[PDB]
Amino acid sequence: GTSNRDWWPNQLDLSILHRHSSLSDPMGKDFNYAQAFEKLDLAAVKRDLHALMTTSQDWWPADFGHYGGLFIRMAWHSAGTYRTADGRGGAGEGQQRFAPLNSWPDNANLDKARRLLWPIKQKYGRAISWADLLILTGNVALESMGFKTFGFAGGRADTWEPEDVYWGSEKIWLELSGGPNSRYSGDRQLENPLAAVQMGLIYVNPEGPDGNPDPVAAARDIRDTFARMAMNDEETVALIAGGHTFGKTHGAGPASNVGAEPEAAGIEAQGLGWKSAYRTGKGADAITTGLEVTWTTTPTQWSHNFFENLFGYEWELTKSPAGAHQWVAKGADAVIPDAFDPSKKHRPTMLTTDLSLRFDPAYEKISRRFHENPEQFADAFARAWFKLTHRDMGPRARYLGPEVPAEVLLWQDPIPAVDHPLIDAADAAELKAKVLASGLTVSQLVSTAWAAASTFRGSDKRGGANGARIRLAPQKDWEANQPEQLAAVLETLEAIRTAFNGAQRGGKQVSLADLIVLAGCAGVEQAAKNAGHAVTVPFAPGRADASQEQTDVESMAVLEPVADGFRNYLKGKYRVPAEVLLVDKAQLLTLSAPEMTVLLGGLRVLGANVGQSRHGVFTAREQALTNDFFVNLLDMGTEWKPTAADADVFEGRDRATGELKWTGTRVDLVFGSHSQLRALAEVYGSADAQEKFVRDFVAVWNKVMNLDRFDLA
Amino acid sequence: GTSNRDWWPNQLDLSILHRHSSLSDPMGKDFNYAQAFEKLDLAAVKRDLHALMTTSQDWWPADFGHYGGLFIRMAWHSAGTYRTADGRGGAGEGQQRFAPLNSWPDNANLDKARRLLWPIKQKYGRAISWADLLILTGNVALESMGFKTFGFAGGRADTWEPEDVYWGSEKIWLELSGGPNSRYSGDRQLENPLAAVQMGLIYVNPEGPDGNPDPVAAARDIRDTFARMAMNDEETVALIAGGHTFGKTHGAGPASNVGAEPEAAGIEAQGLGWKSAYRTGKGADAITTGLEVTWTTTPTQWSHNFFENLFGYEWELTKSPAGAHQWVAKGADAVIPDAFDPSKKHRPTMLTTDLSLRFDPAYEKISRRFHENPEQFADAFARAWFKLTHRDMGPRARYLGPEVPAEVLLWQDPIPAVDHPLIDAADAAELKAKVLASGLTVSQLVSTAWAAASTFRGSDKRGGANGARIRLAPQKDWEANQPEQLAAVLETLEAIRTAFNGAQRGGKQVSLADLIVLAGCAGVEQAAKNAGHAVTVPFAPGRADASQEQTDVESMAVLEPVADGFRNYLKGKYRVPAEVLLVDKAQLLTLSAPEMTVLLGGLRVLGANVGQSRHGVFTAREQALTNDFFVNLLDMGTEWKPTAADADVFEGRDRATGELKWTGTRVDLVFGSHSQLRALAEVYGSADAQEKFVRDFVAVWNKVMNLDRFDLA
Ligand code: HEM
Ligand code: HEM
Ligand SMILES: NNC(=O)c1ccncc1
Ligand SMILES: NNC(=O)c1ccncc1
Ligand SMILES: [Cl-]
Ligand SMILES: [Cl-]
Numbered sequence A, B: 001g002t003s004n005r006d007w008w009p010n011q012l013d014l015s016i017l018h019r020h021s022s023l024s025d026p027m028g029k030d031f032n033y034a035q036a037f038e039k040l041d042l043a044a045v046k047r048d049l050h051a052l053m054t055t056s057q058d059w060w061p062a063d064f065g066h067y068g069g070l071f072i073r074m075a076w077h078s079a080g081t082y083r084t085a086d087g088r089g090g091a092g093e094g095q096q097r098f099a100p101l102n103s104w105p106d107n108a109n110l111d112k113a114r115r116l117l118w119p120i121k122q123k124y125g126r127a128i129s130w131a132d133l134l135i136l137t138g139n140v141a142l143e144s145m146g147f148k149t150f151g152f153a154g155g156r157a158d159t160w161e162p163e164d165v166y167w168g169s170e171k172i173w174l175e176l177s178g179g180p181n182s183r184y185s186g187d188r189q190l191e192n193p194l195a196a197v198q199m200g201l202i203y204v205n206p207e208g209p210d211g212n213p214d215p216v217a218a219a220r221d222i223r224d225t226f227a228r229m230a231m232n233d234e235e236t237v238a239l240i241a242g243g244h245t246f247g248k249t250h251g252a253g254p255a256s257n258v259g260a261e262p263e264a265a266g267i268e269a270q271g272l273g274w275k276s277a278y279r280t281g282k283g284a285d286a287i288t289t290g291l292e293v294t295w296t297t298t299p300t301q302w303s304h305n306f307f308e309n310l311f312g313y314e315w316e317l318t319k320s321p322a323g324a325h326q327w328v329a330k331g332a333d334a335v336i337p338d339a340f341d342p343s344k345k346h347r348p349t350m351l352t353t354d355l356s357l358r359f360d361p362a363y364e365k366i367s368r369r370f371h372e373n374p375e376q377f378a379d380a381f382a383r384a385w386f387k388l389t390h391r392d393m394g395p396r397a398r399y400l401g402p403e404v405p406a407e408v409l410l411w412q413d414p415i416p417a418v419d420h421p422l423i424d425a426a427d428a429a430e431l432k433a434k435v436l437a438s439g440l441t442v443s444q445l446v447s448t449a450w451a452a453a454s455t456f457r458g459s460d461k462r463g464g465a466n467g468a469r470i471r472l473a474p475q476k477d478w479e480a481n482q483p484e485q486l487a488a489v490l491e492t493l494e495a496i497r498t499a500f501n502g503a504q505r506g507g508k509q510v511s512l513a514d515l516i517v518l519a520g521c522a523g524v525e526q527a528a529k530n531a532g533h534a535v536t537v538p539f540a541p542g543r544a545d546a547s548q549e550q551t552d553v554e555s556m557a558v559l560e561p562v563a564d565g566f567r568n569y570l571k572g573k574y575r576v577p578a579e580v581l582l583v584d585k586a587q588l589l590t591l592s593a594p595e596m597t598v599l600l601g602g603l604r605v606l607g608a609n610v611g612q613s614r615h616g617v618f619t620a621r622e623q624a625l626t627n628d629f630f631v632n633l634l635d636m637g638t639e640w641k642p643t644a645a646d647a648d649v650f651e652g653r654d655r656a657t658g659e660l661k662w663t664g665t666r667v668d669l670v671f672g673s674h675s676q677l678r679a680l681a682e683v684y685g686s687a688d689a690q691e692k693f694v695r696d697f698v699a700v701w702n703k704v705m706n707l708d709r710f711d712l713a
C-alpha cells in the first residue's frame, strides 16, 4: 500500500500531534486514573507481587527460584529510555509494552517479565496502570531481596498507542557507529537528543564501545549516556553496581538460536518473542543478550558482594558460550551459585562495563567509597533508583499513594507550598488594571508570560510558569527570553506585587509566578480590546515562587528553547527544518494542529517575536488580537520568494505591483504551504472567523498557562 | 527518523481507525455542518460563482475567457476517485485538497482551480464546505455555459486530514502495467478495489492502455473503470461526451518543463505546484497533461458539436507539442477557436478515449443515439452528472438545501417515507417479549440483526439495516448471511409483525426493518440476562421496508461481505491477511480500535459466527454476554500453535496437560498478538471489567444498529 510518507518522505508529519485521542482510549472520557489509584489497596498488590517473586512458571523458569533480577531489569529498562534533551522516553507512560520498545534487542525477554505480571494486572484492573505496575514490581523485587527503597509514587496513567519518538536514523538493529546513519560524529559526539550508543540499546554496549572490550573507553560511553539520562557519576556507579548486585545475564548458547522479536513473531506467539531453539529455550538454557555473567554469591539477596568481587579479584578476558566478551576472576574459587543446578558453582564474572567502575579513575574513587561504606552505597542506590524511576513524573503534586517520600529533592524542580489565602476575581481584575496602567505593552506582557509558560514539556512534565524560574538563573539569561527586556518587565511587575501585597490584610498575597501569568492575561485582554472585543482571559491563582537555591541550574539547561517557532526564534542553524522544530515544540506543549495554528497566528500579531522581528507579523494593527495573520497569509494577491541573502526568509510582494508587503520565515509560511495546516489557516482566515479566532486563541493561551498546574487536577 | 512502519512493514496499522478525531478538527465538538449549511444563502453563493467564471486572474488566465471547463474537470475529478468496491473516494469528503489527491498527476492544475475558489470559500466560511463548493462550482459552470443541471444537494462535511485509502502498490507515479507492483494480472484484470488503470489516474490513460493509442482497447478500460465507479455504458458515454463538450486540454510544450507537484514544491509555492518553465507557464502556454485537444467549436457553450465532430470526420493519429498521442480530423477546416488568440483557429481533435465512443461497438450505438437525439443526450448527461457527484452522499435524508431533486433514483437505494405512527416504548417491550417467546435463540437474533446492520459503510454511506434489504435479493442469498437460517428467522419475525400490525388501531405499524433490529436488541438483552446482568438495549424506531424494485441487485453486489471478522468469516483465500481485512471492515463501520475489540469479543460469545464455528468462541457459556473472550484469550495457561491441516487456524492447549481447550483463527488471535490490540483486550479481560464490557458492548451494538439512521440526525 503506497502512502503519503512514501511519496513525500520529507513532508511534515502532523499525526504526532493527534495521538492519544479519545478514539484510541478504551477508558471512558471521564476516567480519572488518579482517583482509581488512590483507592487501590497498594499493600495488597505488593503482597501479591512478593508472592510472585518466588512462584516460578514453567514457560519461563525463575533463576535461583526468584524473578527479582528479571523484574529489576524490567523496571530499569522501563525508566532507562529517558533522555534529558527532550524529556522523551522514561517509565511514565508504560511505553515498554508498545512498539518499538517492546522489541528492542535490549528489551529481550522482558516480554516474559511483563507476561508474568498479567495475573496481578488483571486482578487489580484499572486501579493500577501498567506504567505504575512495572515500577512497583521493581520496588517489590528489591524489597523482597532485602533492600530498603526510598519510596514509590503512583500516578503514571497508561497510554494506548506508541509514542512518536526519534530513536535514531539507523535501519539496522544495533548497527555499529560510522555507518550511513551514524549517531556519532567528530570525536565520538553522540547526536542530540539521543542517549544510547546503538539503535535498540538502553545506554551502552555491555561488551564495550562498538564491541571493543576496553573498560576504560566503555566508561566514556557510560558517562556520556548516563549524563544524557540526567545521572551524574555518583548516581551512575550506584545504579550500575546496585542493579548488578542481583540476578544474572543469559547466554547459554549461540545467538543464532534466538528467533524473531515480538513485533515480528508469529501470531501464535501471543505477544512474546525471541523464541530460542537452544535446548529447552528457557531457564538453564536461556539466551537473552548472549552474555553469561552472574555477579554475586547471593544473586537473590542485597549484599555488598558486587564491589567485594570487583575489587577482590583480578579479571581476565574470556568468551561466553555465545561468543560475547566478558571477564572472569583468574583462579578464583567457584563460589557463585548456578541458577538451576544446586551441585554446580561458578567463578565470579563481570561485564566490561562493570569493570569500567573500577578502571575509570573517576568511577574508581566513588566505587571504592561504596565498597568501604556499603551503607553509603545503599543510600545512593536508593536515591538514584527513585530518581530513575520517577524522573519523568513531573511535579510532586502528581505523586500518589502512601509511599511517596516526604523529602523534597533538588532534581524535582520543587515549588514551595502555598501557606496564605489566594487572590480572588476582584483582586485579579485590580492587578490586571494596575499592570495595564504601568505602561507595560501588550507585546511585553505576552512575550514575558509566553517565555515563562512555554518551557513546559509534556514528555517529562518539567517546566512551566510555576515557580517564577524565569526570574532566576539560567532562564533570565536565555537569549530567547530577551534578558534585558525581561529584566525591565520583571522589575515593574515586582513593584506592582510589592505594592499590592503591602496593602493587604489577613495574609493574602500574590506570587510573582501568578502575577507574570496574570499580566500575560491582561495583555491578551488588552489586545482583544484593541481589536474591539471585550473578553476575559481565565486565570487560576496558586503558583508559588521557587528560590535560586531550589533550582539546579545545570539541569535547567535542557529546557532552554533553541527553536521556538511561536516567537519566530532559531538560536542557530540546524539540519532539521524550522517547521519540523515547530511541530516538535507543539508536541512537547501538548498542542493539536489546530491549537498550534491559532496560537502561532495570535502570537505573531501580538508582538511575541523575539527581537521585535517583523517576520510573519502580517498585520497593520500590531498588538490587536485579530485573525490578520491568516487573512493576509492566504491572500493570493501576494507572491512569495526566498530572499537572495537568506533561503529561509521570504519576501511577500504584491503580485501586480511588485511592492514589498511582508517578510516571513519557513515557520510563518508553512501554514500557507502544507495542505493540512493551510486547511486550518483557512478556517481562521474566513470572514466569519473573528469571534472564533479570539475564543480559540484565549482557550489555547489559557491551556499553555496551565500546563504545569497539576495542583489543580 | 526510523519508524515502527520501517521496522515492521507488515504489522497491522490501527491509526486508520483513529483519524478524524476531535484533536485534528478545528471546529468545535458541537459544530454541526448541516445546520450551518441550512442557513447559507445558496443563491448568493451561486451568483458569486457565476461572477467568478469570467473573472480571469493573471496567475492562471481563463481559457476562452471562461473557467467553466476547468471547474467541470475539477468537480469531475473530485467525484471521479470513487470506487464501488469499498465506497472509498468520491467527492463527499473534499479529499482532493489533501495528499495524495492534491498531487496526483491527473489532478495537475486543479490546485489553481481550487485556489480561484478561495475568495468565495473565505466569504461564506463554515457555511459551505470545500467538499460542497467543489461540486457546486461544477454545477454553476455547466449552468453558466447553458446546460441545465438535474439539481444539487449540500451536506458534504469537510474533513481535516487525509483518508487512509489503498490507491495501489506502485512506487512510481503513472507506472505502466506489468511492473513489480502491477495492479493488473491475468487477462487485464484490475485488482480490487482499484478503479483506475495507473497510479495517479482518475480512470484511464487518455492516450490509450499503457499509452498505446488503440480506441477499441481503450474502450475496454473505460468500461471496466467506469463500472468500478458505478457507471454503465449509457452513463459513461453521456459523461465523457458531456464533459468534453466543454473546454480543452493543455499541452503547449514538453512535459519536462513542468515542476514539482504540490506536495513536493517549495514553501514559497504556497500550496500550488506544477510550475512550468515553458514560455509564460500559463494561459496559452499551459501544460497540464500534455495533450492539446479542443473538442468543439464553442468550448464555453453547451452544443451538440461533440458527436457532430466524432462522427463527422475521419481521424488520424498525431502528436501534441508535448509528444502525446492524439487525433486530428482528416481534411477538416480550421473551425475550433483558439483559447487566447482571436485570429487563430484549429482543426477538430480528439483523444483516443473519445474515439472509443465511436469504435467500441456498444458505445457506438449509444453515441449514435445521442447524436440523432440530443435531448436524450442532455437528459442522460444531467442524470449521470448528478449521480457522479452525489454517489457517495448516502441516503436522501442527508441531502440539504433548495435544489435537491424531487425524483427518487434507483441508485440511491431509496427508502420509502414513513406515513404512520411509530411504535413506542410499551410496543417495543411487547415485541421484544414476543420475539423471546417465539423460540428464536440469542444466536439467531444477534446474527440476523448483525447481518442486516453491518452492510453499512461510512465511505459512501450505503448499506445498513434501514430498508430491510436483508430479506431481498441479493442479501438474503449471501453465504455470510446463512440463507437457510436467515429464512427461518425472517419467517418467524414476519409472523410476529403481521400479528402485531393486525392488532393495531389508528394506523400504527412496525416495519420489518425495525423488527429485525429490535429483535437483535432483545437477543442482546437476553444474553445479558443469561450472564446475570440487567440490561436494556436502546432502540430507535422509524426504519422502513424498501421493495425489491427499489433495490438494484447488481449495485448491491459490492456490499457483500467476503471478509467479516466479526462473524469469523472469510469467503475464500485472499492475499491480504484476515486481520487486515478486519481492520478495514471496522473502518467502514466507523469503529475505533476499542469499539472493534469490544464488539468482536461480544459477538464471539453470543454465537454470531457463520456456521456456528467454535473458532474464537472462548467461553463455556455461549449465548451469555460476558467478557469470557478476553479472559480466556489472555490466559497464559494456554499455548497456541497453528494446525497441521491449516496455518490460519490455531489450537490452544493447556500448557501443562496438553489438553485441547480452544481453536481460533487469525482474527481471534490477533487480539492476543498485536501489542495495541492486546492492551485493549487486557482492559476488557480484567477482573473489574465485566460491567464495563457489557455497557461498552451495548453502546457499540447500538452504534452499529444506527449507522444509516440519517433520518434521526
Ligand atoms: C552501563 C549500564 C548497564 C549495562 C551495560 C547493563 C548490561 C546488562 C546486561 C547485558 C544484562 C544481561 C541481560 C540478559 O542477558 O539477560 C543485564 C542484566 C541486569 N542488569 Fe544491567 N546493565 C546496565 C545497567 C543496569 C542498571 C542501571 C540496573 C538497575 C539498577 C541494571 C540491572 C540489571 C539487572 C537486575 C540484571 C539482571 C537480569 C536478570 O537477573 O534476569 N543494570 N545488564
Ligand atoms: C475516459 C474518461 C476520460 C478521459 C480519459 C479524460 C481525459 C481528459 C484529459 C487528458 C483532459 C485534459 C486535461 C488537461 O490537459 O488540462 C480532460 C479535460 C476535461 N475533461 Fe476529461 N476525460 C475523461 C472523462 C471526463 C468526464 C467524465 C468529464 C465530466 C463530466 C470530463 C470533463 C472534462 C472537462 C470539462 C475538461 C476540460 C478542462 C479544461 O477546459 O480545462 N472528462 N479530460
Ligand atoms: N513522545 N512523547 C511526547 O513528546 C509527549 C508526551 C506527552 N505530552 C507531550 C509530549
Ligand atoms: N477511507 N474512508 C473510509 O473508510 C471511511 C470514511 C468515513 N467513514 C467510514 C469509513
Ligand atoms: Cl515517549
Ligand atoms: Cl476516501
Ligand code: NA
Pocket: A087, A088, A089, A090, A092, A392, A458, A459, A460
Ligand atoms: Na518522557
Ligand code: NA
Pocket: B087, B088, B089, B090, B092, B392, B458, B459, B460
Ligand atoms: Na467515499
